[PDB]
């Protein structure tokens, strides 16, 4: 009938007006990029969240380009269903205490998981290493000893590839280098080129932290892209 | 019904030789990776080794690395673990925790406060 | 003139070389409609070639090989200049959207996160127009009398007489090489650049030959698409086409020329690795 | 010591209940069954590829018209779908993106949707003005809402990650009851075709059928390894199917208390997203980590048909009231319509 | 362990509730599920092939 008709044509109106709404939807959600924040309550986040109830969304621009972090707080310590959501996730920042050494082996344990998900095996992890100046006093200090928790570390010698800091003492940084070697260990046990993970030391007063975070976005995408057209 | 087991935990001198048992049953046990977990008095849950599902691939923690030696038999669906010498720090409850999933190289959630498949456990102590 | 043989094998392998090209291009607008958002916009880029691609072999290639064929030897100069308007709108159109294929993958590649902010959907459409427009004016001029065509009996094609304009053969010729090569020489180098502190950061070359090599394919399928054609047209400005040149080289000239529609889908869809993982489970689905 | 021996009285009823339940298992489905003949091969072809989807579909929900269906996914969309003509009715946007699962209410006047906002909220599709508005927002889960499901306009039932599923108030906003006893938190529920009592399956390989009015487990079904993803009510409501991540599907039996079929192959070793059942409920479909969806009878444990189509992991699947068709939801950002 | 005795004597309390149910003949029940499939196959669309003429999809 004619009324039939015209309900065809009202709702082909209202797909119409939809389409064009999920067009600009469509512009905005690819233009912004999207991180999933995780690590303990001990660890240091929030000093990283300072600087920019079931999750937290803190939106900070850097160079005119979008980047939406979400920081998962009333999830149980039970991951392994809710961790499959961040799998198209830009970048997973992993910030870990390394100077809490045993909460080391734990988040290597947790990055082993979080690598080797099936899910998780084209998301890139940038890894934060915080307490960078509670570590180097613990080490300086001597009290406790890194030996003790890790058997390698007594026979590490630190990279002449590695850049020291001039500030710190050879022991301090050899430490920090055994720590990112371990993590590296980890990322590159595994993953053939599908993704890679960025290690970084960081301060509670570093500043610095959020061009690292651009930085590492930038090399994820332009590495991606790369592998798309063969260049790499 | 998935349940885990644990046996041989027992009072012993330091540097004495003591075995552990986890008997496992109510699912196929060449499927899953298998852990060892343990928690101190007063401490949380903290991991300890694991063996891969066909047994080549193990790891230790760092703390007991050289020190404990972690089997399993496929055949009778039993994990062990042997620990040569032990300090008296490590006067814990050890638990046999089952990975989630069969068939996956990744191990969540097996040092969680609730984590289903994780077994009774048995005191092991340590004195003098 | 041309014998009878000569103009027999041309068309053979014109017509087998761009029947490849035609099943080719089916089978990657198949791979390109069936997702729309598989490419973002570069999608409408690549469909864009494919089907100028299309329309060229589809189109110009029929009335190529009946030049060829001697049953009409004596053609009128308005059928012969139509034919060089259409081949050359097709050319020029196949350049453009190569052309913005490159800086697409330049901005793609150098400008990760401000990418999509730079290039939108709008600005996808608009480049497609412009570059269908551009190619419809470089065109017009051997309609509207800038150009100058006719046909040849002993070559048996429609062929331009670039000697007639000078202007318009410097002109075209820009177009075809100067510009393009420019452009895609600079993207290119840059993304070259990109890609050697890539591999640099990766190993912690020998190994850059791969980049070099996927380089060096573009721009030589390119040259070798379309040098030999411009090359042709600055001789015939400064020199007779008949005596200076032979048959043999005016026919392999001519199917280089032709051989664009088979190497844009290789270049450009198959070498992009999703694209060749899609055309691939098709093709395995399929047999 | 009373926790010692304690465990060992839970131990002795726990024999107890598994001696009983022997006792009761005779003859498997499958004996029974062997007369019968099979159901020959069985293919379905898309009919219908609805497009709109940013990101990845998580959940589906069809319409008890048959004809709607509302789907979720990750770009921060909630978008209902007219299936007959692949026209989209309705375009949500979400306060929180990140959305697990949505329910379409039966008398189709309301729509909820949850995550890991830890949140059920719920949009009225019938307002006045003519756009879609939150109408209330339940808050009251510490964990990651998974499932929902409309008793119907005035009261909702949720499952959540806090391993506790609550029955909701929609009018006052507040949970009238609560439902414990699952040690891992819960994935899916099913209601059953009467309101009574419905089912859940939770990370702790265990499924346990609630009454709702009074708000205890009647039983727990324990026969699956890993995690049970999706739970699915059989037609006639004596029996359920679940899909678990040890890459099997087991029939549990309400009034027999057991597993009466497992549908696995050694093909298969990957994990169950979403399972579901036709009208007549002899064809159990299930979707797959493998990008397929199978179709197993329920009577007998062989595969008959097998619906492909989805480059990523089918993460939803939806058959209608009057069984006309499936609707599978994937990662693919795809939802296809199987008639 | 005050919260480890009340969670396990909640567990008690919930199998004691869980052992005192009845349960039928699992025979009894096969065959229930089997007459309900056989009772409704016609009403089927998936089991029984439909003519695309009243098929809203085809």
Same mark, same amino acid.
């Given at each position: 009938?004619?009324?039939?008709?015209?309900?065809?044509?009202?709702?082909?109106?209202?797909?119409?007006?939809?389409?064009?709404?999920?067009?600009?939807?469509?512009?905005?959600?690819?233009?912004?990029?999207?991180? %999933? *924040?995780?690590?303990?309550?001990?660890? @240091? #986040?929030?000093? /990283?969240?300072?600087? =920019?109830?079931?999750?937290?969304?803190?939106?900070?621009?850097?160079?005119?380009?979008?980047?939406?972090?979400?920081?998962?707080?009333?999830?149980?310590?039970?991951?392994?269903?809710?961790?499959?959501?961040?799998?198209?996730?830009?970048?997973?920042?992993?910030?870990?205490?390394?100077?809490?050494?045993?909460?080391?082996?734990?988040?290597?344990?947790?990055?082993?998981?979080?690598?080797?998900?099936?899910?998780?095996?084209?998301?890139?992890?940038?890894?934060?290493?915080?307490?960078?100046? %509670? *570590?180097?006093?613990?080490?300086?200090? @001597? #009290?406790?000893? /890194?030996?003790?928790? =890790?058997?390698?570390?007594?026979?590490?010698?630190?990279?002449?590839?590695?850049?020291?800091?001039?500030?710190?003492?050879?022991?301090?940084?050899?430490?920090?280098?055994?720590?990112?070697?371990?993590?590296?260990?980890?990322?590159?046990?595994?993953?053939?080129?599908?993704?890679?993970?960025?290690?970084?030391?960081?301060?509670?007063?570093?500043?610095?932290?959020?061009?690292?975070?651009?930085?590492?976005?930038?090399?994820?995408?332009?590495?991606?892209?790369?592998?798309?057209?063969?260049? %790499? | 019904?998935?349940?885990?087991?644990?046996?041989?935990?027992?009072?012993?001198?330091?540097?004495?030789?003591?075995?552990?048992?986890?008997?496992?049953?109510?699912?196929?046990?060449?499927?899953?990776?298998?852990?060892?977990?343990?928690?101190?008095?007063?401490?949380?849950?903290?991991?300890?080794?694991?063996?891969?599902?066909?047994?080549?691939?193990?790891?230790?923690?760092?703390?007991?690395?050289?020190?404990?030696?972690?089997?399993?038999?496929?055949?009778?669906?039993?994990?062990?673990?042997?620990?040569?010498?032990?300090?008296?720090?490590?006067?814990?409850?050890?638990?046999?925790?089952?990975?989630?999933?069969?068939?996956?190289?990744?191990?969540?959630?097996?040092?969680?406060?609730?984590?289903?498949?994780?077994?009774?456990?048995?005191?092991?102590?340590?004195?003098? | 003139?041309?014998?009878?043989?000569?103009?027999?094998?041309?068309?053979?392998?014109?017509?087998?070389?761009?029947?490849?090209?035609?099943?080719?291009?089916?089978?990657?607008?198949?791979?390109?409609?069936?997702?729309?958002?598989?490419?973002?916009?570069?999608?409408?880029?690549?469909?864009?070639?494919?089907?100028?691609?299309?329309?060229?072999?589809?189109?110009?290639?029929?009335?190529?090989?009946?030049?060829?064929?001697?049953?009409?030897?004596?053609?009128?100069?308005?059928?012969?200049?139509?034919?060089?308007?259409?081949?050359?709108?097709?050319?020029?159109?196949?350049?453009?959207?190569?052309?913005?294929?490159?800086?697409?993958?330049?901005?793609?590649?150098?400008?990760?996160?401000?990418?999509?902010?730079?290039?939108?959907?709008?600005?996808?459409?608009?480049?497609?127009?412009?570059?269908?427009?551009?190619?419809?004016?470089?065109?017009?001029?051997?309609?509207?009398?800038?150009?100058?065509?006719?046909?040849?009996?002993?070559?048996?094609?429609?062929?331009?007489?670039?000697?007639?304009?000078?202007?318009?053969?410097?002109?075209?010729?820009?177009?075809?090489?100067?510009?393009?090569?420019?452009?895609?020489?600079?993207?290119?180098?840059?993304?070259?650049?990109?890609?050697?502190?890539?591999?640099?950061?990766?190993?912690?070359?020998?190994?850059?030959?791969?980049?070099?090599?996927?380089?060096?394919?573009?721009?030589?399928?390119?040259?070798?698409?379309?040098?030999?054609?411009?090359?042709?047209?600055?001789?015939?400005?400064?020199?007779?086409?008949?005596?200076?040149?032979?048959?043999?080289?005016?026919?392999?000239?001519?199917?280089?020329?032709?051989?664009?529609?088979?190497?844009?889908?290789?270049?450009?869809?198959?070498?992009?690795?999703?694209?060749?993982?899609?055309?691939?489970?098709?093709?395995?689905?399929?047999? | 010591?009373?926790?010692?021996?304690?465990?060992?009285?839970?131990?002795?009823?726990?024999?107890?209940?598994?001696?009983?339940?022997?006792?009761?298992?005779?003859?498997?489905?499958?004996?029974?069954?062997?007369?019968?003949?099979?159901?020959?091969?069985?293919?379905?072809?898309?009919?219908?590829?609805?497009?709109?989807?940013?990101?990845?579909?998580?959940?589906?929900?069809?319409?008890?018209?048959?004809?709607?269906?509302?789907?979720?996914?990750?770009?921060?969309?909630?978008?209902?779908?007219?299936?007959?003509?692949?026209?989209?009715?309705?375009?949500?946007?979400?306060?929180?993106?990140?959305?697990?699962?949505?329910?379409?209410?039966?008398?189709?006047?309301?729509?909820?949707?949850?995550?890991?906002?830890?949140?059920?909220?719920?949009?009225?599709?019938?307002?006045?003005?003519?756009?879609?508005?939150?109408?209330?927002?339940?808050?009251?889960?510490?964990?990651?809402?998974?499932?929902?499901?409309?008793?119907?306009?005035?009261?909702?039932?949720?499952?959540?990650?806090?391993?506790?599923?609550?029955?909701?108030?929609?009018?006052?906003?507040?949970?009238?009851?609560?439902?414990?006893?699952?040690?891992?938190?819960?994935?899916?529920?099913?209601?059953?075709?009467?309101?009574?009592?419905?089912?859940?399956?939770?990370?702790?390989?265990?499924?346990?059928?609630?009454?709702?009015?009074?708000?205890?487990?009647?039983?727990?079904?324990?026969?699956?390894?890993?995690?049970?993803?999706?739970?699915?009510?059989?037609?006639?409501?004596?029996?359920?199917?679940?899909?678990?991540?040890?890459?099997?599907?087991?029939?549990?039996?309400?009034?027999?208390?057991?597993?009466?079929?497992?549908?696995?192959?050694?093909?298969?070793?990957?994990?169950?997203?979403?399972?579901?059942?036709?009208?007549?409920?002899?064809?159990?479909?299930?979707?797959?980590?493998?990008?397929?969806?199978?179709?197993?009878?329920?009577?007998?444990?062989?595969?008959?048909?097998?619906?492909?189509?989805?480059?990523?992991?089918?993460?939803?699947?939806?058959?209608?009231?009057?069984?006309?068709?499936?609707?599978?939801?994937?990662?693919?950002?795809?939802?296809?319509?199987?008639? | 362990?005050?919260?480890?005795?009340?969670?396990?004597?909640?567990?008690?309390?919930?199998?004691?509730?869980?052992?005192?149910?009845?349960?039928?003949?699992?025979?009894?029940?096969?065959?229930?599920?089997?007459?309900?499939?056989?009772?409704?196959?016609?009403?089927?669309?998936?089991?029984?092939?439909?003519?695309?003429?009243?098929?809203?999809?085809?």
């Amino acid at each position: 009938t004619e009324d039939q008709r015209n309900e065809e044509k009202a709702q082909r109106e209202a797909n119409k007006k939809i389409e064009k709404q999920l067009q600009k939807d469509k512009q905005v959600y690819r233009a912004t990029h999207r991180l %999933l *924040l995780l690590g303990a309550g001990e660890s @240091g #986040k929030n000093t /990283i969240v300072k600087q =920019f109830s079931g999750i937290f969304e803190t939106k900070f621009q850097v160079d005119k380009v979008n980047f939406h972090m979400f920081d998962v707080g009333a999830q149980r310590d039970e991951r392994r269903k809710w961790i499959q959501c961040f799998n198209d996730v830009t970048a997973i920042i992993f910030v870990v205490a390394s100077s809490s050494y045993n909460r080391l082996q734990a988040a290597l344990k947790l990055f082993d998981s979080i690598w080797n998900n099936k899910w998780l095996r084209d998301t890139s992890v940038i890894l934060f290493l915080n307490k960078q100046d %509670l *570590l180097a006093e613990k080490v300086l200090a @001597g #009290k406790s000893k /890194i030996e003790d928790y =890790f058997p390698e570390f007594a026979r590490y010698t630190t990279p002449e590839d590695a850049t020291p800091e001039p500030g710190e003492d050879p022991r301090v940084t050899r430490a920090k280098y055994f720590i990112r070697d371990e993590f590296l260990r980890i990322s590159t046990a595994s993953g053939d080129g599908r993704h890679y993970c960025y290690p970084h030391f960081t301060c509670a007063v570093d500043t610095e932290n959020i061009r690292r975070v651009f930085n590492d976005c930038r090399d994820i995408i332009q590495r991606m892209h790369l592998r798309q057209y063969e260049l %790499l | 019904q998935v349940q885990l087991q644990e046996s041989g935990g027992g009072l012993v001198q330091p540097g004495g030789s003591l075995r552990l048992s986890c008997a496992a049953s109510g699912f196929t046990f060449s499927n899953y990776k298998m852990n060892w977990v343990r928690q101190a008095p007063g401490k949380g849950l903290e991991w300890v080794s694991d063996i891969s599902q066909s047994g080549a691939s193990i790891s230790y923690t760092g703390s007991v690395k050289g020190r404990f030696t972690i089997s399993r038999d496929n055949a009778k669906n039993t994990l062990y673990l042997q620990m040569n010498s032990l300090k008296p720090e490590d006067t814990a409850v050890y638990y046999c925790a089952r990975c989630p999933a069969p068939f996956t190289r990744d191990c969540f959630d097996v040092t969680s406060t609730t984590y289903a498949y994780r077994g009774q456990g048995t005191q092991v102590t340590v004195s003098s | 003139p041309i014998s009878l043989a000569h103009g027999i094998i041309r068309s053979t392998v014109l017509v087998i070389f761009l029947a490849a090209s035609f099943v080719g291009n089916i089978v990657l607008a198949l791979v390109l409609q069936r997702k729309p958002q598989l490419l973002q916009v570069t999608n409408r880029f690549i469909f864009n070639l494919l089907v100028t691609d299309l329309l060229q072999i589809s189109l110009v290639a029929p009335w190529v090989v009946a030049t060829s064929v001697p049953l009409f030897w004596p053609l009128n100069s308005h059928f012969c200049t139509a034919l060089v308007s259409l081949t050359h709108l097709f050319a020029f159109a196949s350049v453009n959207t190569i052309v913005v294929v490159s800086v697409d993958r330049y901005l793609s590649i150098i400008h990760p996160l401000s990418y999509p902010s730079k290039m939108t959907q709008r600005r996808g459409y608009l480049l497609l127009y412009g570059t269908w427009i551009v190619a419809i004016l470089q065109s017009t001029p051997p309609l509207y009398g800038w150009g100058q065509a006719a046909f040849d009996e002993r070559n048996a094609l429609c062929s331009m007489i670039w000697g007639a304009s000078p202007s318009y053969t410097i002109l075209s010729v820009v177009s075809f090489i100067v510009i393009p090569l420019i452009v895609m020489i600079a993207c290119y180098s840059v993304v070259f650049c990109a890609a050697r502190r890539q591999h640099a950061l990766l190993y912690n070359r020998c190994y850059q030959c791969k980049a070099a090599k996927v380089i060096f394919i573009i721009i030589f399928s390119y040259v070798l698409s379309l040098g030999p054609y411009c090359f042709l047209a600055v001789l015939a400005v400064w020199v007779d086409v008949e005596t200076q040149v032979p048959q043999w080289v005016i026919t392999i000239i001519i199917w280089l020329f032709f051989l664009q529609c088979c190497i844009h889908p290789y270049v450009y869809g198959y070498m992009h690795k999703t694209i060749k993982k899609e055309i691939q489970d098709m093709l395995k689905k399929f047999f | 010591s009373e926790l010692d021996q304690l465990r060992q009285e839970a131990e002795q009823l726990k024999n107890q209940i598994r001696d009983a339940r022997k006792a009761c298992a005779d003859a498997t489905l499958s004996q029974i069954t062997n007369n019968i003949d099979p159901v020959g091969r069985i293919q379905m072809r898309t009919r219908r590829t609805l497009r709109g989807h940013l990101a990845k579909i998580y959940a589906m929900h069809w319409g008890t018209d048959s004809r709607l269906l509302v789907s979720a996914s990750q770009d921060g969309k909630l978008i209902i779908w007219d299936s007959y003509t692949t026209n989209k009715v309705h375009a949500i946007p979400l306060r929180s993106s990140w959305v697990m699962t949505c329910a379409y209410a039966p008398s189709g006047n309301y729509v909820a949707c949850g995550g890991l906002d830890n949140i059920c909220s719920i949009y009225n599709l019938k307002t006045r003005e003519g756009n879609v508005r939150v109408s209330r927002e339940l808050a009251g889960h510490t964990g990651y809402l998974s499932c929902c499901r409309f008793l119907d306009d005035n009261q909702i039932v949720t499952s959540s990650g806090d391993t506790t599923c609550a029955l909701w108030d929609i009018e006052t906003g507040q949970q009238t009851t609560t439902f414990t006893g699952h040690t891992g938190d819960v994935m899916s529920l099913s209601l059953a075709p009467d309101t009574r009592l419905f089912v859940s399956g939770a990370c702790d390989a265990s499924a346990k059928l609630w009454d709702v009015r009074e708000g205890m487990c009647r039983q727990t079904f324990t026969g699956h390894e890993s995690d049970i993803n999706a739970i699915c009510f059989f037609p006639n409501g004596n029996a359920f199917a679940t899909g678990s991540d040890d890459a099997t599907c087991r029939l549990f039996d309400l009034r027999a208390d057991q597993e009466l079929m497992t549908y696995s192959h050694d093909n298969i070793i990957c994990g169950i997203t979403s399972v579901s059942f036709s009208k007549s409920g002899r064809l159990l479909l299930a979707g797959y980590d493998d990008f397929n969806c199978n179709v197993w009878d329920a009577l007998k444990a062989d595969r008959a048909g097998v619906l492909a189509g989805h480059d990523n992991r089918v993460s939803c699947l939806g058959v209608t009231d009057d069984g006309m068709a499936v609707a599978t939801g994937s990662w693919d950002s795809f939802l296809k319509i199987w008639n | 362990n005050t919260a480890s005795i009340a969670q396990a004597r909640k567990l008690v309390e919930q199998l004691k509730m869980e052992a005192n149910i009845d349960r039928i003949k699992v025979s009894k029940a096969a065959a229930d599920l089997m007459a309900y499939c056989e009772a409704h196959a016609k009403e089927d669309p998936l089991l029984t092939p439909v003519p695309a003429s009243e098929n809203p999809f085809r």
